[PDB]
């Protein structure tokens, strides 16, 4: 509960989605503000329970100012068999970047520069841990009243190798969100690295520059059409790496098209901004700038400090996730993460 005689007081609901319900709250004894995420009926759906487990493990591993942090995870208050809803206490973030972009709030070039900086700073750290987010978009980038940006929602994250047991190994065109989905996922190019995230970053960057989505495709083919209208026809090497014959045949059926310069896509936009944008939005994963190299780009020189943009050591281990687990075994694993959270706090 959250009554006068409990640790937390609920203020108001700030988010309702597939993740559960996020509320603003205060620690009653101190007045300190936090977010509390309720994950209702957390063990009912296997897919959802697996997302919960991998987020708990990843967020416990990370300690970085541009990644959402777990402050507490509430222990069960009922017998083990009746425990059904998980409560996670996190940094309070009043808004997301989607809200900000698509509102009457100011979003000057300097806002874009500062938000992009923070996003990339978080990514350098996450990517050095061998974690790919795979669902970066403005609604997963949280922004607080101090103008601090933190990356959230690690339910779709994976490492540098995913298991053949799960459907997303083969059905890569369904990974995450259409408008931000990297060409390698759309086309099954069999090259799945941290570059996935840099594509999404490019889309987010463009979206901040114009305050409208860069590639808002209505379906699979239309999404590819919109991307090719700017990037041009993909190379013979990329076309040959397309997993599916129909997709490869469809791309070959279209007439040749050269790239449109980013200066034409975004008239009058900042030169250095467009320079960096062009380094992110490439068909070839290996052609894209890394998060680390992006932080060294002239566009971000204002905020860049190589003494204060850390990597993460040791790297994150996804071994736990490749295991074929039942509902009850996943529940046990989640309860163990809660126990371990508190056991580690007792031993510091
Ligand atoms: C998955 C997750 N786990 C923990 C958190 C988390 N979230 C917040 N704050 C939030 C959460 C949601 C909203 C919101 O829904 N705003 C309305 C507009 N929104 C526009 C984009 C489409 C969705 C609707 C605002 C602030 N603070 C701390 C946290 F740890 N999250 C977030 C990313 C939802």
Author numbering: 48 to 395
Task: Reproduce text from the manuscript describing this model.
The aminopyrimidine motif forms a hydrogen-bond network with the backbone of Met140 in the ERK5 hinge region. The amide substituent on the phenyl ring of compound 3 extends into the solvent-accessible channel (the so-called front pocket; FP) and the amide NH donates a hydrogen bond to the side-chain amide carbonyl O atom of Gln146. The terminal piperidine ring provides an additional ionic interaction with the likely deprotonated carboxylic acid of Asp143. The N-isopropyl group of compound 3 is positioned similarly to the benzene ring in the 6,7,6 ring systems of compounds 1 and 2. The most potent allosteric inhibitor, compound 5, has an IC50 of 2.3 µM in an assay of ERK5 kinase activity, compared with an IC50 of 42 nM for the conventional kinase inhibitor 3. Compounds 2, 3 and 5 were tested against a panel of 225 kinases representative of the kinome to assess the selectivity of these three different scaffolds.
The ERK5 protein, which is encoded by the MAPK7 gene, comprises an N-terminal kinase domain and a large C-terminal domain containing transcriptional transactivating functionality and nuclear localization and export sequences (NLS/NES). ERK5 is the effector kinase of a canonical kinase module comprising MEK (MAPK/ERK kinase) 5, MEKK (MEK kinase) 2/3 and ERK5 itself.
